[model samples]
Target: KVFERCELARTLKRLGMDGYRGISLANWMCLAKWESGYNTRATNYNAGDRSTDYGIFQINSRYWCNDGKTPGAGNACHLSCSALLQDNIADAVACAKRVVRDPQGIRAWVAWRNRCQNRDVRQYVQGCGV
Candidate 1:
């Protein structure tokens, strides 16, 4: 949605970062579509135990929520499932930017896309349109 993109872009801009700049808006849209189906409340279920993976990014609450402290103190805490669930797009974009800026994150994304290609799927992990 244009509104969603605008909101996400605004958040990224305010964070002094641009998670969606180098990457195409279509790519981000594809990611949002696949990851959460545009549903902020989407979740996944464990295969055997049937546990839940909550929120938009499908972060395990146990790992991302209270298990650890927030990224920063005061009002600048890094993004977490709790914060993300609140529709705090800035925090989400900031978190993504931090990852994308890391060497490992870039490598991982490349590797992931390659693996997806190996699987013979037309869709790559770059989140671009299928």
Candidate 2:
């Protein structure tokens, strides 16, 4: 599922992503925009680490989800990586929340730091009415 900008913004808001752990909805929007462009099935493989990023938020296999690979990876989110690829984002969202529970918060994603952090991200949720 490839979500429109506003569509994804509102959906994330409805999923309680707004102000989750001091991370604003627009920040989350910016993260998703850069990470996966709102595409539910997006996946990125890292040959160096032998891990894969899965879903719209690009949750990783090494630290977050189990893919039966990644060399004794820690399933911090306690879910299969396949669950992150579904059209329904509930599982992905839950995993995302779990990720932020750490000290890094939303900084766990490098894309967020390079693109979404310290920038005017309001445009992401601007016209969404979210």
Top TM-score: which candidate number?
Answer: 2
lDDT of 1 by residue, 36-85 (tens): 65556666656554334434444443333332432332222244455555
How well is each residue in 101-127 modelled by candidate 2, as lDDT tens digits?
A: 999999999999999889999899888
User: What overall lDDT goes with each candidate model?
Assistant: 0.43, 0.95
| Residue pairs in clash, model 1 | none
RMSD of each: 7.3, 0.6
TM-scores vs. true structure, each candidate = 0.47, 0.98
In candidate 2, residue 76 scores what lDDT?
94
Candidate 1 lowest-lDDT run of ten: 67-76
